[PDB]
Structures are given as C-alpha cells and as structure tokens.
Design a protein around this ligand. Sequence first.
Ligand SMILES: [K+]
Ligand SMILES: [K+]
Length: 129
Amino acid sequence: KVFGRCELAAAMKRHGLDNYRGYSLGNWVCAAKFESNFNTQATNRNTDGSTDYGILQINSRWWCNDGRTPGSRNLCNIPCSALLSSDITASVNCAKKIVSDGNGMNAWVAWRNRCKGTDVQAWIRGCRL
Ligand SMILES: [K+]
Ligand SMILES: [K+]
C-alpha cells in the first residue's frame, strides 16, 4: 500500500508513535518518506545479505526473520513479510523496539541524514489529526 502523507500520519498516531521515546509525529513521517516513499511493500537488499522491509525499512539482521540472513536475530518476533502489510501495526510495534535500543531514531540512517534537525513538523502540516 502506498500511503498518503496525512493518511500515514493518522495511522502512526493511532498506533502510538507521536512523541514515542520523545520523537514527534513529524519525525516518523519524515523517516517513512525517505526510507520507503510511504510504500509498505518497499524492500532494499544490503551488501551484508540482510534486507530492509516496509514503510520504515526495518532490517533483518536484528529485527525480523526472513530465513536468508545468516547469523541474524528476530527481536520483533515476526516474519519480515509482516512488515510489508497494508496494516502498519507490525512495522510500528517493531519500530518502537528499535527506537528504544539506545540510539533513538539514529537507527534510521535516512532519518539522521535527511530529517534530523529539519522542520519535521512540516510533514504533518495540513493534516486532520
Ligand atoms: K535468517
Ligand atoms: K533519543
């Protein structure tokens, strides 16, 4: 599913991400924008053999099981395919574990390089929330 901007903002807020670990809703929408362009079916293969899945491009080395990342863990206790669903619950609940791991939203390199320190509120401006 390709979410609209405000549509994704509303779904993220419903699932608890607004100010989660202190990160305002706009940070999460900005991160989803540059990780997946709001596409739940986004995937990206990495040189280490792991794959990034879904609207927040969550990585199989630590967070989900895809059966093809040797040595990896599954800390969110989900198949990576669950991160591709039109329903973002699994992605959001796993993202919460990720952002709680110690480095905050720096776990998303796209957030660090393209969202951090910017006017991220702009990503939810105009939205009925
Ligand atoms: K594996
Ligand atoms: K933090």
